[PDB]
């Protein structure tokens, strides 16, 4: 019963750091999953940068 | 041209580069920097009738104590009218962030109509910039909202809380026959003692009286009708400790003498319950001011910087990085680019 407390409590833990990995992440995979090579918006937007 | 756009906002509202408006306005983004010398102004348009936060402290007190009989003021009695307080400025706030607001939308305006030729261009580019900025008012006001309820939380006494009246010059004007004349000194009149000195550096401490268990009041005409006069008297001992016949005291006007005797009444004097719970009133009136002078000082300071990590940051951010992708989505880009038959 110990054993399985234990397990347990740690739980919170590792849920707010995968939790904040994906928020540091999320701003730039939002834009990487919608490339497509034939894009003359994407050159354009990276160009003016 | 978005470029043009980007670059304009950005001098128009930080007022950086050269080209600027030396003579026509005070204008340009730069009017929010009065807002932030006018919300100062809002923070003190409010007012209350100090005889309601009497009454109300009273009853706050009453209200402590159920049935127990009171020997030392409650900290609830001060904490209580303190949360009180704090909740009139929910208001202020609302509406300096409410006409900071209306400053963006009007100088994207002018960054967008007036240097715009193409049609339809000129609307997309100020409806989506518009559009952005409303959705930051709703974090913006959220985050003012959990600033305000932290005041609230807790009462801080440890920075610069008053950590445990009235002056002017008077003259004496029956002295005692072994000097005669009259004598003229700085008085100096506090909620707890009476103090004496020769000049305004109230270095002397000549003379020292208490305040309570005095009595005053007015002069039969026996005298040259030239100045106005009160007596100071005491019917418990038969001398004001060092007495001046009962220490007559003469002003220029009748309305310093009754800014006198106020301040008397200010400090626990009656007029020619009462002993205790009166002393608790005032007690608690000061420290009340003394932490709200604190509480608008830290709002004052914070207001602006929130609206800047909140609001405006995050539009700059917006123009630079993300204004051309969201003109990419909108109708169908056949229309857009379109010339207007001028």
Redesign the interface.
């Known amino acids: 019963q110990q054993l399985t407390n234990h397990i347990r409590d740690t739980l919170p833990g590792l849920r707010n750091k995968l939790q904040s990995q994906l928020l540091s992440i999320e701003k730039e995979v939002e834009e990487y999953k919608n490339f497509r090579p034939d894009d003359p918006?994407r050159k354009?937007?990276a160009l003016?940068? | 041209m978005?470029?043009q756009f980007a670059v304009d906002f950005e001098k128009r509202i930080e007022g950086s580069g050269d080209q600027i408006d030396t003579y026509e306005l005070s204008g340009g983004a730069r009017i929010n920097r009065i807002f932030h010398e006018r919300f100062p102004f809002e923070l003190v348009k409010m007012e209350f009738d100090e005889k309601e936060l009497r009454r109300e402290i009273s009853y706050a007190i009453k209200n402590i104590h159920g049935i127990r009989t009171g020997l030392f003021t409650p900290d609830m009695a001060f904490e209580t009218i303190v949360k009180k307080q704090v909740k009139k400025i929910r208001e202020p706030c609302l509406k300096c962030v409410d006409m900071v607001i209306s400053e963006l939308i009007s100088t994207v305006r002018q960054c967008t109509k007036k240097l715009q030729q193409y049609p339809r261009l000129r609307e997309e580019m100020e409806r989506i910039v518009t559009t952005h900025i409303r959705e930051r008012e709703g974090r913006t006001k959220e985050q003012v909202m959990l600033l305000i309820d932290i005041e609230l939380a807790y009462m801080n006494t440890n920075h610069e809380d008053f950590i445990g009246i009235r002056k002017g010059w008077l003259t004496i004007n029956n002295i005692g026959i072994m000097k005669g004349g009259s004598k003229e000194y700085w008085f100096v009149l506090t909620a707890e003692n009476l103090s004496w000195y020769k000049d305004d550096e109230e270095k002397e401490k000549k003379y020292m009286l208490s305040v309570d268990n005095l009595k005053l009041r007015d002069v039969e005409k026996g005298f040259m009708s030239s100045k106005h006069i009160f007596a100071l008297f005491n019917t418990e001992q038969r001398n004001v400790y060092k007495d001046y016949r009962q220490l007559e005291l003469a002003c220029e006007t009748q309305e310093e003498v009754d800014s006198w005797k106020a301040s008397f009444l200010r400090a626990g004097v009656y007029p020619e319950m009462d002993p205790q719970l009166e002393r608790q009133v005032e007690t608690i009136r000061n420290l009340v001011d003394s932490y709200m002078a604190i509480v608008n000082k830290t709002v004052r300071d914070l207001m602006p910087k929130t609206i800047m990590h909140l609001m405006i940051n995050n539009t700059k951010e917006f123009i630079f990085?993300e204004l051309?992708?969201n003109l990419?989505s909108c109708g169908d880009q056949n229309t857009l680019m379109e010339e207007s038959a001028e």
């Open positions: 918006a354009t937007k003016l940068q | 978005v470029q990085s051309l992708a990419y």
